[PDB]
Structure formats: C-alpha cells, structure tokens
Ligand binder design. Sequence first.
Ligand SMILES: Nc1ncnc2c1ncn2[C@@H]1O[C@H](COP(=O)(O)OP(=O)(O)O)[C@@H](O)[C@H]1O
Ligand SMILES: Nc1ncnc2c1ncn2[C@@H]1O[C@H](COP(=O)(O)OP(=O)(O)O)[C@@H](O)[C@H]1O
Lengths: 148, 325, 325, 547
Amino acid sequence: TLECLSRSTLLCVSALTVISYVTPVFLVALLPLAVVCYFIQKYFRVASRDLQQLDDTTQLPLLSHFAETVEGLTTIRAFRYEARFQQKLLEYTDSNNIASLFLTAANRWLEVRMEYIGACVVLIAAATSISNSLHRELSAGLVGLGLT
Amino acid sequence: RARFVSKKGNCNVAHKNIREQGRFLQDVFTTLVDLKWPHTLLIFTMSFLCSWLLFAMVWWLIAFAHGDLAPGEGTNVPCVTSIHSFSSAFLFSIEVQVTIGFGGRMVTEECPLAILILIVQNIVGLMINAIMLGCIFMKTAQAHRRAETLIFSKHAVITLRHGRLCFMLRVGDLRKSMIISATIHMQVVRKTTSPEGEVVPLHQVDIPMENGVGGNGIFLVAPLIIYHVIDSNSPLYDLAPSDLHHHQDLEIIVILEGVVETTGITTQARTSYLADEILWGQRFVPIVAEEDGRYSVDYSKFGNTIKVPTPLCTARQLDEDRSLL
Amino acid sequence: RARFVSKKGNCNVAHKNIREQGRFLQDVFTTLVDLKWPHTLLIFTMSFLCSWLLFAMVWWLIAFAHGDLAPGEGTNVPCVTSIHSFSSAFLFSIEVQVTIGFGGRMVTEECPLAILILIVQNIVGLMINAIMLGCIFMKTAQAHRRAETLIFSKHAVITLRHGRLCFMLRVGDLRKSMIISATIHMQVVRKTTSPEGEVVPLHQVDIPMENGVGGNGIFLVAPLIIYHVIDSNSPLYDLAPSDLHHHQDLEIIVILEGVVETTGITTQARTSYLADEILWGQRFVPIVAEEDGRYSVDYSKFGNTIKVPTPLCTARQLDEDRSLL
Amino acid sequence: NGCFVDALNVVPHVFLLFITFPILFIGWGSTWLHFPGHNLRWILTFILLFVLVCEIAEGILSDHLHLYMPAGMAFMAAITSVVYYHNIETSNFPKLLIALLIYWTLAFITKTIKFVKFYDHLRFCLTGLLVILYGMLLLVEVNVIRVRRYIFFKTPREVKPPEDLQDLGVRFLQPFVNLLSKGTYWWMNAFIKTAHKKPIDLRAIGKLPIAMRALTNYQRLCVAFDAQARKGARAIWRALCHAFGRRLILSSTFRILADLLGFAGPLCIFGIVDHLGKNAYVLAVLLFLALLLQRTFLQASYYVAIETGINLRGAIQTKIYNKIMHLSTSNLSMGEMTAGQICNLVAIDTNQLMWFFFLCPNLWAMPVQIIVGVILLYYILGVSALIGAAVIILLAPVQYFVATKLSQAQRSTLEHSNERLKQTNEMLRGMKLLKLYAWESIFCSRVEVTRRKEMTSLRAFAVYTSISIFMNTAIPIAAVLITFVGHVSFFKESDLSPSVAFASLSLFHILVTPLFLLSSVVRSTVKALVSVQKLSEFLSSAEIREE
Ligand SMILES: Nc1ncnc2c1ncn2[C@@H]1O[C@H](COP(=O)(O)OP(=O)(O)O)[C@@H](O)[C@H]1O
Ligand SMILES: Nc1ncnc2c1ncn2[C@@H]1O[C@H](COP(=O)(O)OP(=O)(O)O)[C@@H](O)[C@H]1O
C-alpha cells in the first residue's frame, strides 16, 4: 500500500507538471478544481471517521460473543438455549454487516465524485489544448504529452 | 334485506309521490356546476360556440340584405367594410364578440341596424361571459375530493370495558388537513310497536357518544375508537347476542359532522352497520406504535381483530348478573 | 420522548400504510392555491407564457406551410396579412390571445384552417384566464396570517383555589379582530391498560373547561386564564407531584376553536403540554392594571411566575386529606 | 422542403416541454413504485442522450439555426421525459403516462416523414437509430399500459408498493432507488449531509433490506451445500461460487465493459493528435463521455463485488456459528478446536475471504483486458508488433515461476504465524504465574525463535516481490524502446506520426497496470485458499450424536 501510494502521488505530480507546461493557461482552471475537491474531501473525512469508529465498536462485541460461546459450551448446550443464542448472533452479525456496508458505500460515493472531478479536468485540459495549442500557440509535440 | 343508508354514505330511501315544479332554472344553474369538469367544459364551449354562430349568421344575413354583400364599387358603403362571404362574416362576429377587434372590417355610421345588432351582441356576450366566469369559480371553490375520505371500519365490535359492555368502532383521517369541531350523532333505527298499539316502520333514537364531562364532539388526529357504554337506560340494552347475526333487523348509523379547514364548509360522513355486519366478543389490534421518535400508525391492522375470552350473554341478563355479581 | 402534537400547532403523528390514488387533479387545483404568493405568481406567468409560445409556434408553422411566409407579391393572399418572420408571428399570437387586437396583421377569409386555430386559441385562452382569476381570488380570500396568532403560555401551572386543586393556563389575542364563539376542547392522552387486559397506546379523554352554569365556549378579549378544577371524577385526579417532572408521559392538549370576524372561517389552535413542561405550586403575575383611564395589559409578565407557599401532595391524597380536613 | 420538416420535428418537443412545466412546478413547489421496463427506459434514454449529442455535432458541421434546432429540442424533451418519469416513480398516475405516450407517437411520426423524404433523395444513420429508439420506448409504454391501468379494464390490480425496501425503519436504499441514481449513489447525499449535523448512531442507521439479511444468505448457502453434497474442501468452494452467482457474474461483465471503454480512450487521443497534425471537437466530447462512462461502470463493479463479499462473510459466519453448536467437547479438548483457534478462524477468515472476493472480479477481467490490448496495438504498430508481442509473451512464464516461488514461502509464513498466536494466547492468560517465579526468558526466547522463522518466510517473500516489481518495470521500458527504434529506422520506413507514438504509450500503460496488481493478488489468493482449507477441516469435526 505504501509503495502504490508513493507511485500514484508521483504520477499525479508528473501529470500536473506536464499539463501546466504544455498549456500555461491551465493554471486558471486548476484552483476551482482544487477548491471543490478540497471541500468534498473535508466533508467525506468526518463521515468516514464516524463510520470507521462505528465499525470497530460493532465488530468488538461480535468476537467477544464468539469467544464466550466457544468456551462456555457445556452450559449453553445444557440449558438448551441454542435458539436464543443463535438469534442473538443473528442480531449482532446483521448490525456488523450494515456498519460495513455503509462504510463501503461512503467510500464508493467519494470515489464516484472524485472520478467526475477527474473527468472535468481531463475534458477541459484537452479542450484548452485543441483550442490554444492549435489556433494561437501552434505547437504539435505538446498535444500528445498533454492528452496522454 | 333492505338497508337504511348505504356504506358509501349515500341515502337508500327512495321517495315517492313527490309534488311538482321544483328547480325553476336556479337549481339548474347549480346542477350545471355539479357536473364533472369534462362535461362542464363541454357545455361551456357549447354555449360559447352557439352564441358565436347565431350572431355570425345574423350578421351575414344583414350584410346580404343591405346589398353590401353584393360585390359592387361605388354608389354605396358597406355597413361593415370589407365583407365578402360567410367566412369573413364569422370572422367579424368572433372579432367583435370576444372583444379582440381586428378592425380590418369596419362597421360604419351609415346603417343604424348594424349599430343595434352590435349593441345587443356586446351586452349578451358580456352577460354570458360573466355567468360562465362566476360559475367556474364557484365550482372551483368546492372540494368534494377532500370530502369523501372519511373511513369507518367495515364491522364494529363490542367488548367488556370497566366491567360494563361497550361499543368499539374505528374512525380516522386520510389527509394532513384536519376537521374542526367534528361531532358524532350516533343513531339506531328499528321497526317499533308502542304499547298504545302504534307500529312505526322505522324509529331513530339517539345513542350517546361517551366522552368527557359532556360534549357531542370529538377530536380527530389519529384513528380514535369511539367509546360508548350501553346501560339499562340505553335503547340498545335489550337485545341478545345470538339473535343479531341472522334474523334481527337493526341498523346502527353514525353521522360524523365537521368543518374542513381550508374551505370552511361543514361536511359529514354517514355510515350504517347492520345486524349481520356487527359481531361479538373481540378486540381491535393496537394501531399506534412508538416509532423511532414519533408515533407510527399502521393501517393494515386497521380492520384486524383478535379473539378475547369474554363472556357471551345479553345486556339485560348481563345487568341482572351484575346486580347478582 | 415522542410528542403528540407540536407546540406550533402542527400534528406530529406520521401516517403509514396509506392506500393510493388521492387528489385526482382537484386537490392539485387547491394545492396550487396553497403555495406562497411568489411561487404562485411564478407558476401563473409560467402557464401564460407556455400557452402563448405554443400557439405562436403553431401560427408560425401554419404561415410557413401555406407558403404565405415565403415573401411573394401576387398570386396569393397570406392567411395572416403582413407576416414575415417568427417575431411577427409571436407578436400576432400575443395580439390575438390576450385580446388586444392591433390589427396591423390581419387574418383573412381565404384559409379556414386559420379560422379553426383562432377559434380554439380564443376559447383555451378564456378558460385559462377564468381559472387563473378564480384561483387568485380564492387564494386572496383566505387569511392564514390572521390565523397563526393564537398564544398559550409555554408552561401551565397548578394552584389551590377555593380549597381545591386547580389548573391555570393563559390564553390570549394578538390583534384587534375578535374571534366569535371560541370554544375549548381540553383533552389528555396516556397509554392506558383496561382491567380487561386491553392496552391502548394512547387514550384521549375530555377534561372539562369549568365556566358558568354550562358552556363549552369562552369569551376572549384580555388574556383569560382557563380555570378547571380536578375532582375525584376527573381523569387527571390520580397522578403524583414528584413523578410528573421526569418519568411519566402525559400530554395535555388544548384545542381552542372559533370563527374569525372578517372572513367568517372557523379556525383553531391546538397546543400540547408534556409531563416535563408542567410544574407545581406557583402563581401567575397579574397582567391587567388600572391605567390612566383604561386597563393596561403587560405581556412581559405573561409568562412570569411567583412562588406560593402551597402544600405539595397528590390529588388523590389531597382528596383523602380533605375528607380528613 | 427540408426546413419544413425540421420545424415539424421541432413542434412535438415544444408540446411536451410546455405540458411538463406546470406539473413539474407543482411537484417542485416515502413509497417507491417501479414499473416494468424502468431500467430499459433509462438505458434507452441514455442512448438517446448520446445520439442527440451526435445530432448536435452534425448541426455544427453543417452550419442555419432551424436546421439543427431539432436536436437541441429533443435534448430538453428527453430530459423532461426523465423528469416526468421521476415524478411518476415517486407518485403513480394513469394520466401522466398517456401524456408521455402521445409525445412518443408524434415524434415517431415526424421521424418517419424525415426518413421517407431522405430515402427519396451521415444523417441517415443518426436518423435511423433515432427512429428505432423512439419505437422501442413506445413499446415500453404499451407494455406499461398492458400491465396495470392505462385504460385497461376498471381496476389496475396495482402492486401495493414493495414493503421489502419500503418498510418503515430503513436508511440504506441501494435496491430501492431509480436506474440513474444507483451508479452515482445520489441517495447518499442526505445521509452524508445529515452526519455532519448530528453524530451517527446504530439507531440512526437503518435495518437491513429483505435481500440483505444474514438469515436468507445462510439459507441459500445451506441449500446449495445440501445440493452439492447430494451430488470436502472443494465442495464448499463450489457452493460459494454457486451461491453468489449472477451478482458476481454481473460484476465481472460491468468490469469488462469498463475495460473496453478504457481502451477506447487512447484511440480518441490518437484521433485528436492526428487532426492536430492536419472532426476534432467531436473527439473531445466523445472522449469525455467515454471516460465518465468507464468511471461509472468501474465503481458499480467495485460496489457489487463488495456486496457479494459482505454477504459471503455473513453467511459463513452464521454457518460456522451454527456448527459450533453440534461440535463435541472431545474436539474442544484437542488443539484443533482451541477457542483461540476458533476466534482466529472467525476474524482472519472474514478478512481473507472478503478481500479475495473483492479482488476476484478484478482478475476475472485481466485476460480480456490483455487480449483487447494486443488486438488494438496490432492496428497501431503494424509489422512492428513482433517486438511488443515477444515482450508480453516472455513476461508470462517467468512471472508464473516467480508466483510459484512466492506462494511456497507464504504458506509456511501462515503456519508459523498461526503457531505464534497460540503461544501468545497461552503466554498472556498466565502472566501472573509467569512473572511469579520468572520463567519469562524461556517463553520470550521461544516467541523470538518463532518470530525469526516467520521473518525468514517474510524476507523470502519480500525479495521475491522486489524481483517481481523489477521485472514488471524493466521488461516494459525495453519493450517500448525496442518497438519505436524498430519502426523508425530498422525496417518500417513509414515515419511514425506522433499520434501513433502517444497512443502506443497509452495502451502500454493500461497494459502495465494489471501486471503490478497481480503480484499483490497472489498474497490474498493463497490466503483465501488456506482459509477455506482451514474452514473445511473445521467443518469436518466430530458431530454430536442424536438420541
Ligand atoms: N390501509 C388503508 N388505508 C386507507 N384506507 C383504508 C385502508 N384499509 C381500508 N381502508 C378503507 O377504510 C375501510 C376500513 O375497512 P377495513 O378495515 O379495510 O375492512 P375490510 O378489509 O373488510 O374492507 C374500508 O372500507 C376501506 O375502504
Ligand atoms: N410579549 C409578547 N407578546 C406577544 N407574544 C408573546 C410575548 N411573549 C411571548 N409571546 C408568545 O407567546 C408564548 C408565551 O410563552 P412565554 O410566556 O413567552 O414563555 P417563554 O418566554 O418561555 O417562551 C411564546 O411561545 C411566545 O411565542
């Protein structure tokens, strides 16, 4: 994970630097992208922290219950309370599942809006390219770098 | 057998030997409003087109009669300038009637007869426009759709509350809009024979709605079971539990009156319960439930019913047993 | 915990499992009136512009189709004289629709299709004008701003009057306009369990408004504390003073009904008081004061309250002590 | 009379846009009812959006306002049809549907007239597809009236909106929303906005849907397990793959479509560069649309994979908890049914099976991806394909051998860590007696020796992964260099226009990304294999004997 993160951040740096070099005008369209992305990341951060905390606080009691059922076997199978204990475990596992599901759903939502942000940036990067680097800049080699 | 007033609220009794001559065009002016929006739009466009065609015909006739319709240059001025055929005549009629006034065809100061036909055309048009506006506004003001939402459980039950036999029946609202000062007039009909040898074919008697210290009205927010307790003084106190299901003919009607908020009109809902409809010794399922942070009402259990181990006996014999126990 | 009806007067109970198909365009004709004056003006201009543009488009189309839009001299007469582009077509549409009739561009008696489009344009315009006038007048007639002024002190108190425990709660007017025949329906809700094993989730019961010989109504000029005395027959007579503050769930609602003067509609105000809202053993400060030559009412002391050395005990135990003293 | 037919087409869009505004403004001023063809309707509406973009492109190429207005009007007409269908999904009516049906019929008529007048004499295709799409939406509307109550006899016999996902008390609605929203998780908006206003709680978050409860997953899983038994470690694996089924397959199909579009992007780059060297803005718009579409479908695939994984976790958790009941204490006395061993089972197998079931749809698209990559790069390289082909064929077998040498270390790693955990368990529950007469050095040296063996396994794994990354970078760069040098001067004699160069670099990067990933995938793959072997040996413990 650490190495993939480093590779991806260096790729992002390279791409931003290349696009800035090919079209010195793009620095007028980068700050709104950064601002909107920053605000949405800030909004996602608190909800993500809350969902992770709730995930942990529901995941602990399920494993406590598992251990206690495993050790105190004879008593539970003596009372013949097995229906009650299975119902209890069903309750706990359903709560665990919903917590995990909401965490991953928030993850997916942030990813989707980030991909829309990336679509915006690549779109208007290519648009400013096809416009400026052809009409007024008249440069050929920079187009390939920019779009790639 | 025959019912007194139907479940939907409409009346069942059909009148015979009515007199004559009722509704001399005023109740027809209101029966017109009563008709459904499509039929009312149809009759409105019908009236308008009828008047338009009538006056178009008379204008074509007068232009033909003066000779101005005969195409000729000089020795005359047409009473209505630039009129050629029936089409332009109808165009002039719709131009002067609905008050658009194109002015391509001009009525002139040569013929006073055209002046008279115009001076009657305009006033009749204004009068028909005024009635057709007032009537559509009057029709618009009502709200029947808001009125027909009153709901009463299909069958009513009896139970034993506070050691006394009681009548339980559900009412309720179906929209956000409330109903102000809703009162209950609970009545019972029966073919009765007086001790003086007089037989009445149907006898309405008020059975009380048991509320607080007094009051004939209630307050409707959630489905509230109307709670009455039959006592030795009540007229319904004499019947038996095994004879009601099949043979007897007893109609218990409720009349819930109340004024709606937005319109301010006083509507009501009337419903009947027959001898074969009502049943014995049961209990409704609790509707309201403590939800997340509110009260949840489930209308699926509205007409649901559970068995209750309650004694089955007649109200007179039940009162005698209460005197004995 | 959950409340029955909110302080502002709106209802809190949320319905579930409602049926279907209610409000088949008539309740939408009234929900339109309900919307705020800005939204209603927006939708009115929207409807008008929609119809105008629709018929302008169809007129430009028909003038294009006949070939009269193709600029040519002779061999034809345009169905609408002097029509050149879409701009003049829209001008003709607004000239014939809203019935101004400039008459610079004249519809002729050569094309009956233009006659038909005009004869439908005018009737649809008249119908939409009639509905948009009736609806704005109907909306105008109401007065909600006059309705929402009812005020009830935030918390109600209990005191000892005439040797009996009593309920004191302030009401009042906020405008010069009076309210005719205002009646009080004072009710209490509670989750009750009958002796027959029946548990109700909420139980409305009428607690009387204690006035003269009779009467369910009052007269509102100045803030008048509604005066009720709980007795052994009252449903509220059984509670305790130390258990109401925190644990118990008792909602005491008041429903003040009455018809306003100028409009004649019957409005009402509903408010709730919880177990944690109501307090014990206090007295309101006298509002009215003998001014220079009138009576001055100070609304700053409306919700103010002073301590009173009154005994604190349950109403059942208080009645037992009254039997002992 | 071309302009005449253009106007005749403009008319019905205007009619619909004018009737939509009163109703839309009343509606703009909690039971979801769905109709058959809903998803088909939204799919067709997106196809309409695309074809309308193409029509606008044609209108730009030709220009004459009245000649390209029909596209700009059908655009708002389709968006307003979407608004109508949202207003009908939220509250059902028999009349709004007829209001749509009228417009569909009239638009079909106008398009037919256009087609005839064209036949008598690029436009043809765009127009033909338009007519076909209008016709299919018409058939959908006819199906809808055939179903419940457009005019049909008296009562709809209407469904009674679904209580499974509409039951009071539910917060999570993925299955209970509209076609277009599921991709974006628009429903989440409220929730994420709410969370900031008030902290989140378990009573805040809802319950689980009808089709999400662990009871039904356990039910399905046991039914499949029984069917498999009537026909061991392999059997339960077959049962798992069977049970998730169609959802898992769908996740794979979404990923494959996303992959084909992801390859499509670089082709648009090639076209843009070629026109820059010399039908270009269309390339930008189409490229933007393609990128957006790939992102949407990739995220949907990830979501459905996660769904399948969480359901797997729930089902196997409840299955092993039910089986713990019938387990006999004579197994509990043995090391195989150690309590610490069973809790390690639950926790780490939840983890490993969930991670493998998130990464399995990702690898069920690597083969199709690489195949399409090479079939695309042939048409771009030409006779210079041999070098890249030899490179990406020389990559595979050495990678297979490296992965084998990796898995062998990883399995022994797991065995050693599993014994270390039990040594720690028996070390911590007796720290009192341990510190009492100070036997610490012995147990600490034993755990240190176990840690050293585990570290040997880990260092073997790490050296092998380093060699893997070295290869996965060195072979690619050599490939690019060789191919380009070969084309320019070695044989081809056709000057590589920069478009070819950059498109090759793009496709090549797309090919490179999966290879780096598969090395990490093996780490979860052998772990899933080991976890299932352990789970099957745990299920094979001694039963309790019924009287
Ligand atoms: N869930 C509901 N929501 C609104 N109205 C209802 C509902 N169920 C029934 N109604 C109406 O109110 C009346 C209540 O009767 P009901 O309890 O349904 O007994 P039944 O099922 O035999 O008709 C019915 O006549 C029906 O028209
Ligand atoms: N001076 C006033 N004039 C008019 N209305 C008032 C005045 N004071 C309060 N009200 C309204 O009437 C109600 C009386 O409650 P109040 O006596 O003010 O207790 P509190 O101060 O705790 O709100 C309040 O809800 C308020 O909206």
